[PDB]
Amino acid sequence: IIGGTECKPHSRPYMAYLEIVTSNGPSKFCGGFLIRRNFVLTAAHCAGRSITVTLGAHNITEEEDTWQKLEVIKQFRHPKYNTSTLHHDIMLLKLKEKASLTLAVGTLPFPSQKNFVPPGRMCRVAGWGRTGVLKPGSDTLQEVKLRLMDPQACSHFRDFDHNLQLCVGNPRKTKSAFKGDSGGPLLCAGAAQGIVSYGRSDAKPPAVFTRISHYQPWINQILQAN
Ligand SMILES: Cc1cccc2scc(Cn3c(=O)n(CCCC(=O)O)c4ccccc43)c12
Ligand SMILES: *[C@@H]1O[C@H](CO)[C@@H](O)[C@H](O)[C@H]1NC(C)=O
Ligand SMILES: *[C@@H]1O[C@H](CO)[C@@H](O)[C@H](O)[C@H]1NC(C)=O
Ligand SMILES: [Zn+2]
CATH class of the missing domain: 2.40.10.10 (Trypsin-like serine proteases)
Known part of the structure:
Protein backbone atom coordinates (compact mmCIF):
# COMPACT_ATOMS: atom_id res chain seq x y z
CA ILE A 1 0.00 0.00 0.00
CA PRO A 13 -10.24 -9.74 10.72
CA TYR A 14 -11.04 -11.12 7.26
CA MET A 15 -7.66 -10.13 5.79
CA ALA A 16 -5.49 -13.01 4.62
CA TYR A 17 -1.72 -13.00 4.14
CA LEU A 18 -0.69 -15.48 1.44
CA GLU A 19 2.73 -17.01 0.90
CA ILE A 20 2.89 -18.66 -2.52
CA VAL A 21 5.45 -21.33 -3.35
CA THR A 22 6.77 -22.13 -6.82
CA SER A 23 9.15 -24.77 -8.18
CA ASN A 24 11.89 -22.51 -9.56
CA GLY A 25 11.76 -19.39 -7.41
CA PRO A 26 11.59 -17.97 -3.85
CA SER A 27 8.15 -17.72 -2.28
CA LYS A 28 5.95 -14.78 -3.29
CA PHE A 29 3.35 -12.94 -1.22
CA CYS A 30 -0.17 -11.63 -1.77
CA GLY A 31 -3.29 -10.57 0.05
CA GLY A 32 -6.74 -12.12 0.12
CA PHE A 33 -9.86 -12.24 2.27
CA LEU A 34 -11.85 -14.88 4.13
CA ILE A 35 -15.41 -15.18 2.81
CA ARG A 36 -16.27 -18.56 4.35
CA ARG A 37 -14.47 -20.28 7.24
CA ASN A 38 -12.79 -22.54 4.67
CA PHE A 39 -12.60 -20.25 1.63
CA VAL A 40 -10.32 -17.33 0.81
CA LEU A 41 -10.85 -15.10 -2.22
CA THR A 42 -7.76 -13.67 -3.96
CA ALA A 43 -6.33 -12.90 -7.42
CA ALA A 44 -5.73 -15.69 -9.94
CA HIS A 45 -2.23 -14.45 -10.74
CA CYS A 46 -1.30 -15.34 -7.16
CA ALA A 47 -1.67 -19.05 -7.99
CA GLY A 48 1.30 -21.34 -7.43
CA ARG A 49 2.40 -24.88 -6.63
CA SER A 50 1.19 -24.54 -3.03
CA ILE A 51 -0.12 -21.75 -0.81
CA THR A 52 -0.20 -21.09 2.93
CA VAL A 53 -2.73 -18.69 4.39
CA THR A 54 -2.06 -16.71 7.56
CA LEU A 55 -5.18 -15.30 9.19
CA GLY A 56 -5.26 -13.00 12.22
CA ALA A 57 -2.00 -11.22 11.45
CA HIS A 58 -0.98 -7.57 11.68
CA ASN A 59 2.81 -7.50 11.92
CA ILE A 60 3.61 -10.63 9.90
CA THR A 61 7.20 -10.74 11.17
CA GLU A 62 6.12 -11.50 14.73
CA GLU A 63 4.05 -14.62 15.38
CA GLU A 64 1.26 -14.30 17.94
CA ASP A 65 -1.69 -16.27 19.33
CA THR A 66 -4.14 -14.58 16.94
CA TRP A 67 -2.29 -16.23 14.04
CA GLN A 68 -3.86 -19.13 12.18
CA LYS A 69 -1.44 -20.54 9.60
CA LEU A 70 -3.75 -22.59 7.41
CA GLU A 71 -3.13 -25.19 4.74
CA VAL A 72 -4.78 -24.71 1.34
CA ILE A 73 -6.11 -28.01 -0.01
CA LYS A 74 -7.10 -26.80 -3.47
CA GLN A 75 -6.81 -23.71 -5.68
CA PHE A 76 -9.79 -22.72 -7.83
CA ARG A 77 -8.41 -20.32 -10.42
CA HIS A 78 -11.09 -18.82 -12.65
CA PRO A 79 -11.33 -20.96 -15.85
CA LYS A 80 -11.17 -17.88 -18.07
CA TYR A 81 -8.22 -16.25 -16.32
CA ASN A 82 -5.85 -14.99 -19.01
CA THR A 83 -2.20 -14.12 -18.36
CA SER A 84 -1.94 -11.79 -21.37
CA THR A 85 -5.04 -9.66 -20.74
CA LEU A 86 -5.29 -10.34 -17.00
CA HIS A 87 -9.06 -10.56 -17.35
CA HIS A 88 -10.82 -12.74 -14.78
CA ASP A 89 -7.97 -12.34 -12.30
CA ILE A 90 -9.84 -14.09 -9.52
CA MET A 91 -9.28 -17.27 -7.53
CA LEU A 92 -10.86 -19.13 -4.60
CA LEU A 93 -8.71 -21.01 -2.10
CA LYS A 94 -10.27 -23.89 -0.20
CA LEU A 95 -8.72 -24.33 3.24
CA LYS A 96 -8.03 -27.87 4.48
CA GLU A 97 -9.91 -27.01 7.65
CA LYS A 98 -12.41 -24.37 8.68
CA ALA A 99 -10.76 -21.43 10.40
CA SER A 100 -11.56 -20.60 14.01
CA LEU A 101 -13.67 -17.52 14.63
CA THR A 102 -11.94 -15.15 17.03
CA LEU A 103 -11.88 -11.41 17.60
CA ALA A 104 -8.96 -11.29 15.15
CA VAL A 105 -10.37 -13.69 12.57
CA GLY A 106 -13.77 -13.56 10.92
CA THR A 107 -15.37 -13.77 7.49
C1 LIG B 1 -1.28 -4.95 -7.54
C2 LIG B 1 -0.56 -3.88 -8.31
C3 LIG B 1 -1.00 -2.53 -8.11
C4 LIG B 1 -0.38 -1.46 -8.79
C5 LIG B 1 0.69 -1.72 -9.68
C6 LIG B 1 1.14 -3.03 -9.91
S1 LIG B 1 2.39 -3.50 -10.95
C7 LIG B 1 2.22 -5.14 -10.59
C8 LIG B 1 1.20 -5.42 -9.65
C9 LIG B 1 0.86 -6.85 -9.18
N1 LIG B 1 1.50 -7.97 -9.89
C10 LIG B 1 2.75 -8.46 -9.60
O1 LIG B 1 3.46 -8.00 -8.71
N2 LIG B 1 3.08 -9.50 -10.43
C11 LIG B 1 4.35 -10.27 -10.40
C12 LIG B 1 5.43 -9.62 -11.29
C13 LIG B 1 6.72 -9.29 -10.50
C14 LIG B 1 7.83 -8.64 -11.36
O2 LIG B 1 7.72 -8.59 -12.59
O3 LIG B 1 8.80 -8.18 -10.77
C15 LIG B 1 2.05 -9.70 -11.25
C16 LIG B 1 1.78 -10.67 -12.37
C17 LIG B 1 0.57 -10.57 -13.02
C18 LIG B 1 -0.47 -9.55 -12.66
C19 LIG B 1 -0.29 -8.64 -11.65
C20 LIG B 1 1.01 -8.69 -10.90
C21 LIG B 1 0.52 -4.16 -9.22
C1 LIG C 1 7.12 -5.61 13.34
O1 LIG C 1 7.82 -6.39 14.32
C2 LIG C 1 9.25 -6.34 14.15
C3 LIG C 1 9.86 -7.26 15.18
O2 LIG C 1 9.85 -8.61 14.74
C4 LIG C 1 9.75 -4.90 14.29
O3 LIG C 1 11.15 -4.85 14.02
C5 LIG C 1 9.00 -3.97 13.32
O4 LIG C 1 9.37 -2.62 13.57
C6 LIG C 1 7.49 -4.14 13.49
N1 LIG C 1 6.79 -3.36 12.49
C7 LIG C 1 6.27 -2.18 12.81
C8 LIG C 1 6.72 -0.98 12.00
O5 LIG C 1 5.46 -2.04 13.73
C1 LIG D 1 -5.79 -14.69 -23.83
O1 LIG D 1 -6.55 -13.74 -24.59
C2 LIG D 1 -5.95 -13.46 -25.88
C3 LIG D 1 -6.79 -12.38 -26.54
O2 LIG D 1 -6.23 -11.09 -26.31
C4 LIG D 1 -5.89 -14.74 -26.73
O3 LIG D 1 -5.22 -14.47 -27.95
C5 LIG D 1 -5.15 -15.85 -25.97
O4 LIG D 1 -5.25 -17.07 -26.69
C6 LIG D 1 -5.74 -16.04 -24.57
N1 LIG D 1 -4.94 -16.98 -23.82
C7 LIG D 1 -5.50 -18.07 -23.31
C8 LIG D 1 -5.68 -18.13 -21.80
O5 LIG D 1 -5.88 -19.01 -24.01
ZN1 LIG E 1 -2.19 -9.14 17.80
Whole structure:
Protein backbone atom coordinates (compact mmCIF):
# COMPACT_ATOMS: atom_id res chain seq x y z
CA ILE A 1 0.00 0.00 0.00
CA ILE A 2 1.35 3.41 -1.00
CA GLY A 3 0.52 6.54 0.99
CA GLY A 4 -1.57 4.66 3.52
CA THR A 5 -1.67 4.37 7.30
CA GLU A 6 -1.06 1.40 9.58
CA CYS A 7 -4.30 -0.36 10.45
CA LYS A 8 -5.44 -0.70 14.05
CA PRO A 9 -4.24 -4.24 14.86
CA HIS A 10 -6.80 -6.85 13.77
CA SER A 11 -9.42 -4.23 12.77
CA ARG A 12 -9.87 -6.12 9.48
CA PRO A 13 -10.24 -9.74 10.72
CA TYR A 14 -11.04 -11.12 7.26
CA MET A 15 -7.66 -10.13 5.79
CA ALA A 16 -5.49 -13.01 4.62
CA TYR A 17 -1.72 -13.00 4.14
CA LEU A 18 -0.69 -15.48 1.44
CA GLU A 19 2.73 -17.01 0.90
CA ILE A 20 2.89 -18.66 -2.52
CA VAL A 21 5.45 -21.33 -3.35
CA THR A 22 6.77 -22.13 -6.82
CA SER A 23 9.15 -24.77 -8.18
CA ASN A 24 11.89 -22.51 -9.56
CA GLY A 25 11.76 -19.39 -7.41
CA PRO A 26 11.59 -17.97 -3.85
CA SER A 27 8.15 -17.72 -2.28
CA LYS A 28 5.95 -14.78 -3.29
CA PHE A 29 3.35 -12.94 -1.22
CA CYS A 30 -0.17 -11.63 -1.77
CA GLY A 31 -3.29 -10.57 0.05
CA GLY A 32 -6.74 -12.12 0.12
CA PHE A 33 -9.86 -12.24 2.27
CA LEU A 34 -11.85 -14.88 4.13
CA ILE A 35 -15.41 -15.18 2.81
CA ARG A 36 -16.27 -18.56 4.35
CA ARG A 37 -14.47 -20.28 7.24
CA ASN A 38 -12.79 -22.54 4.67
CA PHE A 39 -12.60 -20.25 1.63
CA VAL A 40 -10.32 -17.33 0.81
CA LEU A 41 -10.85 -15.10 -2.22
CA THR A 42 -7.76 -13.67 -3.96
CA ALA A 43 -6.33 -12.90 -7.42
CA ALA A 44 -5.73 -15.69 -9.94
CA HIS A 45 -2.23 -14.45 -10.74
CA CYS A 46 -1.30 -15.34 -7.16
CA ALA A 47 -1.67 -19.05 -7.99
CA GLY A 48 1.30 -21.34 -7.43
CA ARG A 49 2.40 -24.88 -6.63
CA SER A 50 1.19 -24.54 -3.03
CA ILE A 51 -0.12 -21.75 -0.81
CA THR A 52 -0.20 -21.09 2.93
CA VAL A 53 -2.73 -18.69 4.39
CA THR A 54 -2.06 -16.71 7.56
CA LEU A 55 -5.18 -15.30 9.19
CA GLY A 56 -5.26 -13.00 12.22
CA ALA A 57 -2.00 -11.22 11.45
CA HIS A 58 -0.98 -7.57 11.68
CA ASN A 59 2.81 -7.50 11.92
CA ILE A 60 3.61 -10.63 9.90
CA THR A 61 7.20 -10.74 11.17
CA GLU A 62 6.12 -11.50 14.73
CA GLU A 63 4.05 -14.62 15.38
CA GLU A 64 1.26 -14.30 17.94
CA ASP A 65 -1.69 -16.27 19.33
CA THR A 66 -4.14 -14.58 16.94
CA TRP A 67 -2.29 -16.23 14.04
CA GLN A 68 -3.86 -19.13 12.18
CA LYS A 69 -1.44 -20.54 9.60
CA LEU A 70 -3.75 -22.59 7.41
CA GLU A 71 -3.13 -25.19 4.74
CA VAL A 72 -4.78 -24.71 1.34
CA ILE A 73 -6.11 -28.01 -0.01
CA LYS A 74 -7.10 -26.80 -3.47
CA GLN A 75 -6.81 -23.71 -5.68
CA PHE A 76 -9.79 -22.72 -7.83
CA ARG A 77 -8.41 -20.32 -10.42
CA HIS A 78 -11.09 -18.82 -12.65
CA PRO A 79 -11.33 -20.96 -15.85
CA LYS A 80 -11.17 -17.88 -18.07
CA TYR A 81 -8.22 -16.25 -16.32
CA ASN A 82 -5.85 -14.99 -19.01
CA THR A 83 -2.20 -14.12 -18.36
CA SER A 84 -1.94 -11.79 -21.37
CA THR A 85 -5.04 -9.66 -20.74
CA LEU A 86 -5.29 -10.34 -17.00
CA HIS A 87 -9.06 -10.56 -17.35
CA HIS A 88 -10.82 -12.74 -14.78
CA ASP A 89 -7.97 -12.34 -12.30
CA ILE A 90 -9.84 -14.09 -9.52
CA MET A 91 -9.28 -17.27 -7.53
CA LEU A 92 -10.86 -19.13 -4.60
CA LEU A 93 -8.71 -21.01 -2.10
CA LYS A 94 -10.27 -23.89 -0.20
CA LEU A 95 -8.72 -24.33 3.24
CA LYS A 96 -8.03 -27.87 4.48
CA GLU A 97 -9.91 -27.01 7.65
CA LYS A 98 -12.41 -24.37 8.68
CA ALA A 99 -10.76 -21.43 10.40
CA SER A 100 -11.56 -20.60 14.01
CA LEU A 101 -13.67 -17.52 14.63
CA THR A 102 -11.94 -15.15 17.03
CA LEU A 103 -11.88 -11.41 17.60
CA ALA A 104 -8.96 -11.29 15.15
CA VAL A 105 -10.37 -13.69 12.57
CA GLY A 106 -13.77 -13.56 10.92
CA THR A 107 -15.37 -13.77 7.49
CA LEU A 108 -16.25 -10.76 5.37
CA PRO A 109 -20.04 -10.82 4.87
CA PHE A 110 -20.41 -11.87 1.23
CA PRO A 111 -22.53 -11.53 -0.70
CA SER A 112 -23.90 -8.34 0.86
CA GLN A 113 -26.61 -5.87 -0.19
CA LYS A 114 -27.54 -6.06 -3.88
CA ASN A 115 -25.87 -3.95 -6.57
CA PHE A 116 -24.56 -4.43 -10.11
CA VAL A 117 -22.63 -1.21 -9.51
CA PRO A 118 -20.48 -0.25 -6.47
CA PRO A 119 -21.99 2.87 -4.81
CA GLY A 120 -19.77 5.58 -3.34
CA ARG A 121 -16.73 7.26 -4.86
CA MET A 122 -14.47 6.68 -1.85
CA CYS A 123 -13.47 3.13 -0.93
CA ARG A 124 -10.68 1.54 1.08
CA VAL A 125 -8.12 -1.20 0.44
CA ALA A 126 -5.64 -2.89 2.77
CA GLY A 127 -2.57 -5.09 2.38
CA TRP A 128 1.02 -5.93 3.31
CA GLY A 129 2.35 -4.84 -0.07
CA ARG A 130 5.24 -2.54 -0.94
CA THR A 131 4.88 1.06 0.22
CA GLY A 132 6.82 2.44 -2.73
CA VAL A 133 8.51 1.47 -6.00
CA LEU A 134 11.87 0.73 -4.36
CA LYS A 135 10.31 -0.09 -1.00
CA PRO A 136 9.89 -3.61 0.43
CA GLY A 137 6.60 -5.15 1.53
CA SER A 138 5.19 -3.65 4.73
CA ASP A 139 5.63 -5.66 7.95
CA THR A 140 2.27 -4.38 9.16
CA LEU A 141 -1.18 -4.27 7.58
CA GLN A 142 -1.66 -0.90 5.88
CA GLU A 143 -4.87 0.66 4.57
CA VAL A 144 -5.67 3.60 2.31
CA LYS A 145 -8.78 5.45 1.13
CA LEU A 146 -9.07 5.60 -2.67
CA ARG A 147 -11.39 7.21 -5.22
CA LEU A 148 -13.36 4.95 -7.56
CA MET A 149 -12.81 6.41 -11.03
CA ASP A 150 -14.81 6.51 -14.25
CA PRO A 151 -13.51 3.84 -16.66
CA GLN A 152 -11.85 6.49 -18.87
CA ALA A 153 -9.20 6.96 -16.19
CA CYS A 154 -7.92 3.44 -16.90
CA SER A 155 -8.01 3.67 -20.69
CA HIS A 156 -4.21 3.48 -20.86
CA PHE A 157 -4.45 -0.12 -19.62
CA ARG A 158 -5.37 -1.36 -23.11
CA ASP A 159 -7.03 -4.53 -21.81
CA PHE A 160 -9.08 -2.82 -19.09
CA ASP A 161 -12.79 -3.68 -19.39
CA HIS A 162 -15.42 -1.62 -17.53
CA ASN A 163 -17.69 -4.67 -17.24
CA LEU A 164 -15.01 -6.87 -15.67
CA GLN A 165 -12.98 -4.35 -13.67
CA LEU A 166 -12.95 -1.21 -11.53
CA CYS A 167 -10.63 1.77 -12.01
CA VAL A 168 -9.29 2.77 -8.59
CA GLY A 169 -7.16 5.69 -7.45
CA ASN A 170 -7.07 9.40 -8.31
CA PRO A 171 -4.10 9.93 -10.67
CA ARG A 172 -3.51 13.30 -8.98
CA LYS A 173 -2.53 11.49 -5.77
CA THR A 174 0.16 8.93 -4.94
CA LYS A 175 -2.18 6.83 -2.78
CA SER A 176 -2.68 3.39 -4.32
CA ALA A 177 -2.64 -0.36 -3.93
CA PHE A 178 0.68 -1.73 -5.16
CA LYS A 179 2.79 -4.86 -5.61
CA GLY A 180 2.07 -7.29 -2.80
CA ASP A 181 -1.48 -6.01 -2.32
CA SER A 182 -2.94 -8.29 -5.01
CA GLY A 183 -5.93 -10.32 -3.84
CA GLY A 184 -6.93 -7.76 -1.24
CA PRO A 185 -10.56 -6.55 -1.07
CA LEU A 186 -11.73 -3.09 -2.06
CA LEU A 187 -14.40 -2.04 0.42
CA CYS A 188 -16.99 0.61 -0.37
CA ALA A 189 -19.52 1.29 2.40
CA GLY A 190 -18.21 -1.82 4.13
CA ALA A 191 -18.99 -4.18 1.25
CA ALA A 192 -16.34 -5.89 -0.88
CA GLN A 193 -16.70 -4.51 -4.40
CA GLY A 194 -13.37 -5.39 -5.96
CA ILE A 195 -10.10 -7.28 -5.66
CA VAL A 196 -6.63 -5.79 -6.17
CA SER A 197 -5.37 -6.96 -9.57
CA TYR A 198 -2.70 -4.85 -11.29
CA GLY A 199 -1.40 -1.44 -12.34
CA ARG A 200 1.75 0.36 -13.50
CA SER A 201 5.17 -0.79 -12.33
CA ASP A 202 5.99 2.87 -11.64
CA ALA A 203 3.08 3.01 -9.17
CA LYS A 204 1.26 5.88 -10.89
CA PRO A 205 -2.43 5.38 -10.08
CA PRO A 206 -5.11 4.46 -10.90
CA ALA A 207 -4.86 0.68 -10.51
CA VAL A 208 -7.09 -2.07 -11.89
CA PHE A 209 -9.33 -4.10 -9.57
CA THR A 210 -11.40 -7.17 -10.40
CA ARG A 211 -15.11 -6.27 -10.29
CA ILE A 212 -16.63 -8.78 -7.84
CA SER A 213 -20.29 -8.48 -8.89
CA HIS A 214 -19.45 -10.04 -12.26
CA TYR A 215 -18.27 -13.25 -10.57
CA GLN A 216 -21.10 -13.85 -8.11
CA PRO A 217 -22.45 -16.85 -10.04
CA TRP A 218 -19.01 -18.43 -10.44
CA ILE A 219 -18.20 -17.92 -6.77
CA ASN A 220 -21.49 -19.47 -5.61
CA GLN A 221 -20.95 -22.45 -7.92
CA ILE A 222 -17.52 -23.21 -6.48
CA LEU A 223 -18.71 -22.76 -2.89
CA GLN A 224 -21.69 -25.00 -3.64
CA ALA A 225 -19.74 -27.83 -5.28
CA ASN A 226 -17.16 -27.89 -2.47
C1 LIG B 1 -1.28 -4.95 -7.54
C2 LIG B 1 -0.56 -3.88 -8.31
C3 LIG B 1 -1.00 -2.53 -8.11
C4 LIG B 1 -0.38 -1.46 -8.79
C5 LIG B 1 0.69 -1.72 -9.68
C6 LIG B 1 1.14 -3.03 -9.91
S1 LIG B 1 2.39 -3.50 -10.95
C7 LIG B 1 2.22 -5.14 -10.59
C8 LIG B 1 1.20 -5.42 -9.65
C9 LIG B 1 0.86 -6.85 -9.18
N1 LIG B 1 1.50 -7.97 -9.89
C10 LIG B 1 2.75 -8.46 -9.60
O1 LIG B 1 3.46 -8.00 -8.71
N2 LIG B 1 3.08 -9.50 -10.43
C11 LIG B 1 4.35 -10.27 -10.40
C12 LIG B 1 5.43 -9.62 -11.29
C13 LIG B 1 6.72 -9.29 -10.50
C14 LIG B 1 7.83 -8.64 -11.36
O2 LIG B 1 7.72 -8.59 -12.59
O3 LIG B 1 8.80 -8.18 -10.77
C15 LIG B 1 2.05 -9.70 -11.25
C16 LIG B 1 1.78 -10.67 -12.37
C17 LIG B 1 0.57 -10.57 -13.02
C18 LIG B 1 -0.47 -9.55 -12.66
C19 LIG B 1 -0.29 -8.64 -11.65
C20 LIG B 1 1.01 -8.69 -10.90
C21 LIG B 1 0.52 -4.16 -9.22
C1 LIG C 1 7.12 -5.61 13.34
O1 LIG C 1 7.82 -6.39 14.32
C2 LIG C 1 9.25 -6.34 14.15
C3 LIG C 1 9.86 -7.26 15.18
O2 LIG C 1 9.85 -8.61 14.74
C4 LIG C 1 9.75 -4.90 14.29
O3 LIG C 1 11.15 -4.85 14.02
C5 LIG C 1 9.00 -3.97 13.32
O4 LIG C 1 9.37 -2.62 13.57
C6 LIG C 1 7.49 -4.14 13.49
N1 LIG C 1 6.79 -3.36 12.49
C7 LIG C 1 6.27 -2.18 12.81
C8 LIG C 1 6.72 -0.98 12.00
O5 LIG C 1 5.46 -2.04 13.73
C1 LIG D 1 -5.79 -14.69 -23.83
O1 LIG D 1 -6.55 -13.74 -24.59
C2 LIG D 1 -5.95 -13.46 -25.88
C3 LIG D 1 -6.79 -12.38 -26.54
O2 LIG D 1 -6.23 -11.09 -26.31
C4 LIG D 1 -5.89 -14.74 -26.73
O3 LIG D 1 -5.22 -14.47 -27.95
C5 LIG D 1 -5.15 -15.85 -25.97
O4 LIG D 1 -5.25 -17.07 -26.69
C6 LIG D 1 -5.74 -16.04 -24.57
N1 LIG D 1 -4.94 -16.98 -23.82
C7 LIG D 1 -5.50 -18.07 -23.31
C8 LIG D 1 -5.68 -18.13 -21.80
O5 LIG D 1 -5.88 -19.01 -24.01
ZN1 LIG E 1 -2.19 -9.14 17.80
